[PDB]
Amino acid sequence: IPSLRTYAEPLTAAMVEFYTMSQERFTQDTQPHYIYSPREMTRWVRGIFEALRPLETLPVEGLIRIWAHEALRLFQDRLVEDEERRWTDENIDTVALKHFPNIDREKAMSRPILYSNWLSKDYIPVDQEELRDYVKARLKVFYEEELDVPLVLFNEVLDHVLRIDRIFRQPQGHLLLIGVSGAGKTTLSRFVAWMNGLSVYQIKVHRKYTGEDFDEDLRTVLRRSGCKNEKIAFIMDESNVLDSGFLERMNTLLANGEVPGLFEGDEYATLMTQCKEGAQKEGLMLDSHEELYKWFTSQVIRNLHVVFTMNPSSEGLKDRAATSPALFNRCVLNWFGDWSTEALYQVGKEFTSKMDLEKPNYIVPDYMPVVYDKLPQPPSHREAIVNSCVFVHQTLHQANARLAKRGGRTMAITPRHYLDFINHYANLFHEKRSELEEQQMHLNVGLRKIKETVDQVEELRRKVNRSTALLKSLSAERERWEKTSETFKNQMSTIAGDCLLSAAFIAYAGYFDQQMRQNLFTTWSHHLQQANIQFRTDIARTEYLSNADERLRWQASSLPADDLCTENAIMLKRFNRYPLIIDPSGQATEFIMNEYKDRKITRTSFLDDAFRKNLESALRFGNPLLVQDVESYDPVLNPVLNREVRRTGGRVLITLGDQDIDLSPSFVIFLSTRDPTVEFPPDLCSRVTFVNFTVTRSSLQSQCLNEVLKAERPDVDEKRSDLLKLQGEFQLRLRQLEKSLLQALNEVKGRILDDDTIITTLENLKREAAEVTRKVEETDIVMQEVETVSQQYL
């Protein structure tokens, strides 16, 4: 550009200035990957030059902007914490202003310094909103292409996808993404690789996976890349490496661009022939061995990009650098980290953009606990609900820290947990709202019919005795019907906080013991009360989540009658990721076996060799599958756990290992083990919900009392058992007759003159009065006696 020549001598100085600071601030004494060398300045100049190649004319403002963008792509990514990031941004702007006193700061230094070559054909700056819209449309296309799993597009996603696209566009582009599992590293990498035409190829690690298998995988990918040239996004995960041999093979492949001796003997000759054919197709005439080998190595360097995804484990960074320096030398390091409060707030709003959270009369409290950094200080109801959601997710981290400091193992919190929490919140909101609205509709139409009946009886009074009798008997219920209709508005008011608390409980506190679950729920309730969020207190979570109808089936299905077991059954019922049962005793195993017995649930284990076949059978038949011995986890389950389905015009299709099989919608899979103190592979930590079937003090106390009453006083134990079951049958009948009354009352579109209605209502009232007679008598004269015998043995 023959107009920025005069800017050659300032620019350089500025870069050097900034570079020197990054050497004297981010030392390797803090983290092992904080090494800044002239290599960073080399890739800086290369990036600026590439951003200036196709472009024709550009003011000093554009040059400063490109320089700052490159410095952010070279000095703002490997950083781990946000304080260093803020320092880097402050000093980049400061040095730019110092070295260019006569500059338009706003034009050169905007906050979202973004660049892309998707919207335009030339690498140029792009506004955030247009990029968001474009990536939304492209992601909609991508869904139909692969991974129908939806994704939210917050500010961070856009930054990361731009960085990964930059790296994929380079000739030998190796990327190293460090972030918590489930944060989207793999799916973002696959998305951008699809955008760039790369054929993503990932190794299928399994229990038998050994060095020879990985060598064959390397042979496959290298044969595809070098000969039969095609770009490949070879994606590796820090768990997909088992042996150090894998690490050294990847080290030499990354650094050299070609692993020596991988193709030995016959493989060498076959590769030589294939390279010769590829050279003839391309046009190069090569015969010698080393010429073809160098051509193949160049092709592999040009058309093979390796993406290593690793977990930010302290003291594992230095070890991984020692065991393979290429990752820290020939790989650009992107620190995804964990989703910021901003990212969590954005995904919460985006998914709860359908919920009816608007409350015009929401009184803003004098004090509000601010968790989101950019929370509007006069927020509406939605901006307080999402704030409390991100507060709950931040509360899980504090709970994990408290458990770790004084206690045993803690399971890592991932963004997938937040996604499940939000999905549960939305689903529970729709379900509870629909049930309450339908109940109110039925109640209102029934009450209108009762008013019409009153009109009838009054206009006949102005054949009568039965009318007045049924009027009085029905008014005995009309009083509570009117109470419920009046409280309908109150129940609708508090449906937001209750669904929030229930979703947070059934999505997060699935691993903790009773004390920690109660403490978490109490903290959430205290915070919601601080934010003046309406929620019906004095209502147990287990009763709200599950009615008595399915509780009867569960108790009859060999499930202990206690709070924790009921909650665990609830979690087993409403689940997004397939469950994992952690029970010392085996009770949950036969509980699940009986519950899904009618569906022909099959028993299988990882250790069993036929495990694959049975699995395949289920995948093609839609029958429930329970898998034990989860400690020896088989990673072939990784797609089906993430629902890597593919719509084929009506059929969902799933790839297991290397073979692709159609999926049946009736397929449900369960995982379980008998070891409370056992460590699971990190890849399986975030792919499955956790339910802990621990022993409660009250649960054990009940078992002791029941057994001692069975042995010491068999007669009293028999009475206790026959009255408990009889009471449950009365409650079932009470719900049946009560609901049938309303159903029949809604169904009739005439009046009391109908012959069937009068007899139905009289028989129903008689039957419920008689049932109340038995209920009251058994709860008075026989339950008190049973209580006294159990009281002395308590």
């Binding site: 359908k354 608007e358 015009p360 729709h430 629909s434 609205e437």
Partner: protein, 316 residues
Amino acid sequence: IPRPPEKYALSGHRSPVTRVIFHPVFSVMVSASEDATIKVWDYETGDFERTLKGHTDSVQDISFDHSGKLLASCSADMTIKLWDFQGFECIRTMHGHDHNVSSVAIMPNGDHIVSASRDKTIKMWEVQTGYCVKTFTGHREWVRMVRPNQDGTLIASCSNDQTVRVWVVATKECKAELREHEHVVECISWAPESSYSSISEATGSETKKSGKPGPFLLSGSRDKTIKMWDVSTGMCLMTLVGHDNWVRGVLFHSGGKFILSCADDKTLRVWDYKNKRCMKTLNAHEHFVTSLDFHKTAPYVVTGSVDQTVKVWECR
């Protein structure tokens, strides 16, 4: 013009159908009935699409916007539901507005809605928030139907007080109070510009200095008479008689050349107002006809009825 043979008679509702409307852009028809459900039909092939059971009590009126993406519905539960015709779920349910809300409408601006009920007032709500800002009072009784003008600067309300009021949106004044019906006015409708000039020779209306024939309005009532009114002058332009019972709906043909009416006489009547040449009557339904609608482009009309059957007819 609609002729004898009904093309489809779609019968899925469990309660008397109240009002049927067309989607502005899609080949989709929407119906509201007393069973607290909003049904979606395909009037092109007579197919069922979807049903929306979100409302509590009987649904009275429904209305789309210009773009066809939002649908505001009203029911006797004292609520106004804002349905997103994209996600097919409630994005807002504005409360208040006491008693049975009789009508709801989206003004052409598409950012605010109007609602009329038993509580002797008409409230205007924002689509964005749902907070009541203006509340028109002055009607002495139940207000039945409300529909704004085509530019959104005026609204009209008919009521059981047998008076029809034309209100100005901007400054809350009663521009006109036309009170001439012999019975309760049930339906009102504005006139498209494409027929204003027609009105000029239809009634002999004289032009003012501005040259505009003046905004026109219609009102059908239980008096079996349909009055056409000049909003600018507040005069009774012309009254049309011939229905055997209460008129429930009245509207203009898209060509601005005929008037269509559906009444309690179980028949739909197509009349000519410029020359009184046409007085066609067709036996619409075996029972009461609750609402009628004409497709803006397609030659299709849709009639809702108490017999829980929605009948579609073709125009030739």
